[PDB]
């Protein structure tokens, strides 16, 4: 809401599971620090240790 | 041409190990079968045939 009276409901939070026939998950391209444009970005919470 | 098409980047990931300076080096390598395939124009390789 960039102002007070701006109601919007279009952002959709999406989770998925890593399976090679459907969801290939790879590192970011180190030559560009940018995903190649036929791919999509994603994020994942990763802990440190025990 | 292989770098522009984003849907063929995987092969672009593989050719980085054998990008040769001159094609005559690739012809000499495939004559000794050091290589196995080489992407090049048609009439040049028909002349080599
Ligand atoms: C925590 O660190 C130890 C270091 O020896 C490692 O063996 C273990 O797998 C780590 N656990 C996690 C959850 O990262
Ligand atoms: C860290 O915690 C997980 C939780 O189940 C455990 O499976 C793993 O063995 C632990 N890492 C160790 C003890 O290095």
UniProtKB/Swiss-Prot annotation, chain A:
Outcome of substituting residue 22 to A: Decreased sensitivity to glutamate
Please quote what the entry notes about the protein's domains: Contains an N-terminal domain, a ligand-binding domain and a transmembrane domain. Agonist binding to the extracellular ligand-binding domains triggers channel gating.
Question: How is the quaternary structure described?
Answer: Heterotetramer. Forms heterotetrameric channels composed of two GluN1/zeta subunits (GRIN1), and two identical GluN2/epsilon subunits (GRIN2A, GRIN2B, GRIN2C or GRIN2D) or GluN3 subunits (GRIN3A or GRIN3B) (in vitro). Can also form heterotetrameric channels that contain at least two GluN1 subunits and at least two different GluN2 subunits (or a combination of one GluN2 and one GluN3 subunits) (in vitro). In vivo, the subunit composition may depend on the expression levels of the different subunits. Found in a complex with GRIN1, GRIN3A and PPP2CB. Found in a complex with GRIN1 and GRIN3B.
Function comment? Component of N-methyl-D-aspartate (NMDA) receptors (NMDARs) that function as heterotetrameric, ligand-gated cation channels with high calcium permeability and voltage-dependent block by Mg(2+). NMDARs participate in synaptic plasticity for learning and memory formation by contributing to the slow phase of excitatory postsynaptic current, long-term synaptic potentiation, and learning.
What tissues has this protein been observed in? Detected in brain cortex, olfactory bulb, hippocampus including the dentate gyrus, striatum, thalamus, superior colliculus, inferior colliculus, midbrain and cerebellum (at protein level). Detected in brain cortex, hypothalamus and cerebellum.
Q: Which organism is it from?
A: Rattus norvegicus (Rat)
Glycosylated position list: 49-50
Q: Which residues form a coiled coil?
A: none
Task: Please state which protein family the record places this protein in.
Answer: Belongs to the glutamate-gated ion channel (TC 1.A.10.1) family. NR2A/GRIN2A subfamily.
**Recorded superkingdom:** Eukaryota
Give the stretch of the parent protein shown, with its full length. Answer: 395 to 444 of 1464
Protein name as it appears in the record: Glutamate receptor ionotropic, NMDA 2A
Tell where it localizes: Cell projection, Dendritic spine; Cell membrane; Synapse; Postsynaptic cell membrane
From Swiss-Prot, chain B:
Post-translational modification summary for this protein? NMDA is probably regulated by C-terminal phosphorylation of an isoform of NR1 by PKC. Its phosphorylated state is influenced by the formation of the NMDAR-PPP2CB complex and the NMDAR channel activity.
* Primary role: Component of N-methyl-D-aspartate (NMDA) receptors (NMDARs) that function as heterotetrameric, ligand-gated cation channels with high calcium permeability and voltage-dependent block by Mg(2+). NMDARs participate in synaptic plasticity for learning and memory formation by contributing to the long-term potentiation (LTP). Channel activation requires binding of the neurotransmitter L-glutamate to the GluN2 subunit, glycine or D-serine binding to the GluN1 subunit, plus membrane depolarization to eliminate channel inhibition by Mg(2+).
Tissue expression summary: Detected throughout the brain, in brain cortex, cerebellum, thalamus and olfactory bulb.
Task: Please give the superkingdom of this protein's source.
Answer: Eukaryota
Q: Where does glycine bind?
A: 41
Say which species the protein is native to: Rattus norvegicus
Q: Tell me the subunit arrangement.
A: Heterotetramer; the NMDAR subunits are modular and harbor tiered domains that function in concert to regulate opening and closing of the cation-selective ion channel pore. Forms heterotetrameric channels composed of two GluN1/zeta subunits (GRIN1), and two identical GluN2/epsilon subunits (GRIN2A, GRIN2B, GRIN2C or GRIN2D) or GluN3 subunits (GRIN3A or GRIN3B) (in vitro). Can also form heterotetrameric channels that contain at least two GluN1 subunits and at least two different GluN2 subunits (or a combination of one GluN2 and one GluN3 subunits) (in vitro).
Provide the protein name: Glutamate receptor ionotropic, NMDA 1
What is stated about domains? A hydrophobic region that gives rise to the prediction of a transmembrane span does not cross the membrane, but is part of a discontinuously helical region that dips into the membrane and is probably part of the pore and of the selectivity filter. The extracellular N-terminal domain (ATD) is a site of allosteric regulation to modulate overall receptor function.
Tell where it localizes.
Answer: Cell membrane; Postsynaptic cell membrane; Synaptic cell membrane; Postsynaptic density membrane
Whole-protein residues included? 692 to 740 of 938
Record family assignment: Belongs to the glutamate-gated ion channel (TC 1.A.10.1) family. NR1/GRIN1 subfamily.
């Amino acid at each position: 809401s960039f102002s007070d009276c701006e109601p919007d409901d279009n952002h959709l939070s999406i989770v998925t599971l890593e399976e090679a026939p459907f969801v290939i998950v790879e590192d970011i391209d180190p030559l560009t620090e940018t995903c190649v444009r036929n791919t999509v970005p994603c994020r994942k919470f990763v802990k440190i240790n025990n | 041409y292989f770098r522009r098409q984003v849907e063929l980047s995987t092969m672009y990931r593989h050719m980085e190990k054998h990008n040769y300076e001159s094609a005559a080096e690739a012809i000499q390598a495939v004559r000794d079968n050091k290589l196995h395939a080489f992407i090049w124009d048609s009439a040049v390789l028909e002349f080599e045939a």
